[PDB]
Amino acid sequence: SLINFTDGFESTGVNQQPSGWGNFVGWQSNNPNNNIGQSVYALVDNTRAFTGNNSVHFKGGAAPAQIVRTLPAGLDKVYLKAMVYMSKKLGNEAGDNHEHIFGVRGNVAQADNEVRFGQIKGHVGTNEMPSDDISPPQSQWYSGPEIAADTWHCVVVEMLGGNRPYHQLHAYLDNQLIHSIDSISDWNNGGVNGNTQWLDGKLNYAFFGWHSFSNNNADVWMDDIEISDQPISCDSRELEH
Amino acid sequence: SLINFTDGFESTGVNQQPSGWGNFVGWQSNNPNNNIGQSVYALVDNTRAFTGNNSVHFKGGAAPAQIVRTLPAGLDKVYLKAMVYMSKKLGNEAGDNHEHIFGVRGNVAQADNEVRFGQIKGHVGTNEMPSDDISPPQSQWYSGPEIAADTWHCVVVEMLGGNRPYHQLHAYLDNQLIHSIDSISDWNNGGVNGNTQWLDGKLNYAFFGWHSFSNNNADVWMDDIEISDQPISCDSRELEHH
Ligand SMILES: [Ca+2]
Ligand SMILES: [Ca+2]
Ligand SMILES: [Mg+2]
Ligand SMILES: [Mg+2]
Ligand SMILES: [Mg+2]
Ligand SMILES: [Mg+2]
C-alpha cells in the first residue's frame, strides 16, 4: 500500500551499481568509488543470477558492501525479501560475533542507527544499533538453523512497528520461520534499553548486502529483491529450484 | 617549517571535543554526535592527564574514536607524538589482527587511504590502506616489544616521504626505536603492491585515537600531542626515569 517494490537488476549494465539504488560501501553512504577495481563493492553481475541475466554482487567483509533504497514516510511495518547466495553460511557457527545481510536504517550516513538481520553470536538473528543488543539470548548462541553457503535461498524478514504494544521481527528461510522477536525477553541484554517501540525511526532506508563484525570476507549475490508494507513470501520457483 | 603544533587540551572544557580538532568517530568524519552520552567518543577528560588537568579520552573499539588535524599542503615528512595511556597493551599479543593509535590519511571521509601505527598481528607496527599490507613480516608476529597497559608512554612516529628512493617509517617508545620500515622486504605481503613512494598522498590529515580491527574495546588517553615537519622527541619528564 505505501510501497510495493521489486528489482531483478535486469536493466543495469554489468559492473555498474544497481540503477535507482544508493550504496553503503566501505562505511560511506553513496561512496563514489563503488566499482570493479576495488576490493569492496556492490555491483551488477551477469555471471550468476536467480532469474534473468543479472544479480547484484556484494564483495565485502568487515568493510560493508550494500545497496540502499529510501522507504516512504509513514511506514509502520516493512517486509524485506531476496533470493540470496552466499560464500559462507549464517547460523550454527562457533566463534561468530555477528554478521548481516538485510536491514533498515534511520540515517543514511551512519550504521549506528539500524536493525541488522543475519546472525548474532553464531545463531540466525538480529543486532540493533545504537543499543548493540542482540536476539536471541545467550542460551541459543552458536547453534540453530543454518543458512547454508553456495546455494540460492529465499529469505524474508517481517518488521512490525507502529502502534502495537511491542515491536516485533520474524525471519524466514524458504517460508519456514527461523527467528522471532516477540517480547523483551527475546533480547540478550535487557531489550534495546527497555524500548518497546524499538523500530521507531528505523524505517527510513532498506539495505541489502554483506557486513561482517566477525572479520569474515564474503561474496554474496542477491536477486529478485522485494520490499513492501504488505507481506511477501517465496513462490514455487523460489522454493523448488 | 610548515607545521609545529602542540596541544595539552587545557583550554577545552571537560566532556567537549578538543577545540580546533576535527573528529573521526564511528566511521564518520566530524560526527556531530561526539559526546559523553555515546558509547564511542573523543572528548576532553580531567580524570587523568600527563601535564596539567586535562587529556583527550578516546572510547572506542571496532568503531574508531579519533581526533583529526588538517596538515599543510606539500609535506614531504611528518612527525606525530603524544603521551599515551591505554586500557590494554600493544605488541606481544596473541590472536591480534591489527589495531592503531596514530596515523595519517589522504581523504578525510574514509579510513581506506591511510597509514596506521600501533600493532599488526600482535607485534608493534604498521598497516597501510588500501593495500592492507602490514609490517613487520610473519616471522615476527605475536611477539616483540610491548607498549604496556595502564601507564604513560611517550610515542613518536616519524614518516619520511618525498623524493627518496624508498619511503620510511620509524616508531619510538620513550625515544627507543621499536619499529622500522625502510625496505620493501619489511612488508609481509610483498610491499604495498610494489609502491616505493608509499606515503604519496597520505600526509593530508593526522589522526590520533583508538581503532581496533581485533574487536577490542579500549579507553585511551593522550596528552601533550605534537605534530611537526621537523623532528619531535621526548623530554626527561616524559621519559619518566623515576
Ligand atoms: Ca535477475
Ligand atoms: Ca594536559
Ligand atoms: Mg534454495
Ligand atoms: Mg515474489
Ligand atoms: Mg612511561
Ligand atoms: Mg614536547
Numbering used by the authors:
A (entry chain B): 3 to 243
B (entry chain A): 3 to 244
Give sentences from the paper.
We therefore set out to characterize two previously unstudied proteins from the shipworm symbiont Teredinibacter turnerae that were initially identified by the presence of carbohydrate binding domains appended to uncharacterized domains with probable redox functions. One of these was TERTU_3803, which contained both a CBM10 and a CBM2 domain attached to a range of distinct modules (via flexible linkers) that did not bare any sequence similarity with catalytic domains typically found within carbohydrate-active enzymes. Using a ‘module walking’ approach, we searched for other genes coding for these X-domains. This led to the identification of TERTU_2913, which lacks CBMs but contains predicted X122, X183 and X132 domains. Taken together, these sequence analyses suggested that TERTU_3803 and TERTU_2913 could have a role to play in cellulose metabolism, and furthermore that role is likely to be a redox one given the presence of cytochrome domains within their linear amino acid sequences.
In addition to our work on Ttpf08450-X173, we produced TtX122A and TtX122B, representing the X122 domains from TERTU_3803 and TERTU_2913, respectively. The electron density was readily interpretable allowing two molecules of TtX122A to be modelled in the asymmetric unit without breaks in the chain representing residues 3 to 244 of the protein coded for in our construct. Three molecules of TtX122B were present in the asymmetric unit, with chain B’s electron density most readily traced allowing modelling of residues 2 to 235 without breaks in the chain. Chains A and C had some areas that displayed more disorder, so there were breaks in the model between residues 190 and 192 in chain A and residues 162 and 165 in chain C. In addition to protein and water molecules, two magnesium ions were modelled into the electron density on each protomer in TtX122A based on coordination geometry and bond lengths [Fig. S4(a)]; these ions presumably bound from the crystallization medium. Our subsequent structural analysis therefore focused on single protomers from each structure. The overall structures of TtX122A and TtX122B reveal that these domains adopt a β-jelly-roll fold [Figs. 4(a) and 4(b)]. Since there was limited functional similarity between the proteins identified in our structural comparisons, we performed a sequence alignment of 648 X122 family members and mapped the sequence conservation of each amino acid onto the surface of TtX122A using the ConSurf server. This revealed two significantly conserved patches on the protein surface [Fig. 4(c)], one of which was located around the calcium binding site implicated in stabilizing the fold, whilst the other forms a conserved surface on the inner face of the β-jelly-roll fold centred around Arg118 [Fig. 4(d)].
